[PDB]
Amino acid sequence: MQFDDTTGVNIPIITELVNDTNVQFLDQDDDDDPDTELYLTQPFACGTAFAVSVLDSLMSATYFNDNILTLIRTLVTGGATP
Amino acid sequence: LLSIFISTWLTAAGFIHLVENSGDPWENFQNNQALTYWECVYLLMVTMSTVGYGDVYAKTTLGRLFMVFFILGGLAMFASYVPEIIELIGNRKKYGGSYSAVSGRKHIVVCGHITLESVSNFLKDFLHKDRDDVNVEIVFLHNISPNLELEALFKRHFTQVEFYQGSVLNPHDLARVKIESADACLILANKYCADPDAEDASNIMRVISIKNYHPKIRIITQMLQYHNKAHLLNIPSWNWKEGDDAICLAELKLGFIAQSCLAQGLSTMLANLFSMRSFIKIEEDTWQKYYLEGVSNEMYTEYLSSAFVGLSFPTVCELCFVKLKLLMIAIEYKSANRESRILINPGNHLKIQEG
């Protein structure tokens, strides 16, 4: 989309994704390779794409420390008190 | 499996070798037999393959007894331990692998919904007898394995068609079909579905994926609506001028009917003008004899001579008709102000521009 007083490419957006191998499509700019680590992917690094699958990693990180989850839950939800 | 096979084989060979070297206790070891261990291994490999030469055989009754028990033990090992495990090493993949990039073979990758009905017409009017210089090897890529009818169809076109299983979203699968180097990739679409915005947006997704892999490929796709085709101009890598074109089934299919409502039968002309159809010479004075004299006419694009520049359009049509017997349906007028816009039967007021 385009506008006057600019180009709609400057608009900050976050879309929710449901696949890891689907994030490269959001970024118009060329990337080094199709097979790019999700963390290394330009759209993820910019923070314009939230994949739902990285939350699956938190079950690992909650396993090794009992306090990661309450830290994220109080940092993010804004005082999710019981 | 190989270790337990070799261990059982060598163990039983050693046991029957020890039995056949000595004699028999009830015969007081008077019935020996001289067997080297390698000949004995030859014996119990000839046995468990059910060949049974008999050049070397057991001569002790205690040895024959162990052979009777051991062939039953070998079958009990063969019928109950291996024959499901052999079948686990028997699932060979039907449609895998990759494409062998033969030089001079610009392999068209065709993806999207693939079925005998949709592919057959396309294969019949693409790989036709009356083509000029077809050295082009069609590479289908689709995740659903085909039924037996498509097996029979792909067997008919063996030298030109290769099928592969997998999506066009995994870029590894695009790496298998060598999408990076191909003349163009054509994405087909189903004629029918429950929701046209399902397969429309799925084909837009496939266009996004294929242009994301290699941004310099021509894609000729299909759409089912007109209001979903504006999503193809969305992509920055999609250049229509570069030759990436989208054919809208709804606009063309139900535009031909609309122009036919004006001129009764224009659909037959504009369908026989582009399908590579075989002329059958009919001698008998039927209607087909007059019909097939226009089927063999097709449409071409051509730059103009310099001598035609500056003249008027009916003058150049008059020269191209009487002098060269060629009908010029339309011309392309290119200006800085606007993108060149095809003009059909341009009026005399419009004159020819150079080139």
Add this chain to the structure above:
Amino acid sequence: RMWWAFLASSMVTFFWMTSVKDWAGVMISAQTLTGRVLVVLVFALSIGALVIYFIDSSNPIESCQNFYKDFTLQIDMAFNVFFLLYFGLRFIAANDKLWFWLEVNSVVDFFTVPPVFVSVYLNRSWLGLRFLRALRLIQFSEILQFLNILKTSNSIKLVNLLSIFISTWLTAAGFIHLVENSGDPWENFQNNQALTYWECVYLLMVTMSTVGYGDVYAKTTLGRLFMVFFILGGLAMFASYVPEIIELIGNRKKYGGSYSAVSGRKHIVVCGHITLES
């Protein structure tokens, strides 16, 4: 006995150009009519050479062969010249220079032509590894496509299976024939056995059908060893290469065909929904 003078030589033998390497590069692929005739004329002369080995079986393993003799021997050498000039161009014309060092179409030629081109300087002949040239019969289904008879790919797979069957069968028969003609080195070749090649082919066809008569059998321990390895190799070929391909030639259609118009039988055609109840 200079059998090792040929075999050890064969083992040690096993042990601007960018535009001339591709002069025959069009002739490799099936692109011109000229590229056909090269594979056709290496295949027909391979058939002709195989015939000489079949005739050679009657002859003694080691013999003296001069230049002015029976013309089969004289044209065999010209066949070998044509062979070496055929596969010699593909050393530089091969894209990969690594897998040509162990290619099955190259090991088959490392062991036949260098014994001949040493034996010219020796003016002799030993019945060497000349049975191996039936391994080029896998290129049969290549050249039977070009004569426009094999067009259905099921026929091409059938021809492939029959060709690899006959080639493996004749190759192993030739190998065990060569082993059983000579004796044993540790027994100093005192344990020979006289076997014609046709009886040897009878043996290795009786074997791979698991019949096993025993009218003809291996008597050398080195021969029995090759029989032990070869029945396992035959089962490994049978359990892993054919048994899915046999099942591909096993889908017979249940209800096809047509009606035989017997006279006096006005056949009512009944169509539409058909069920046991209706």
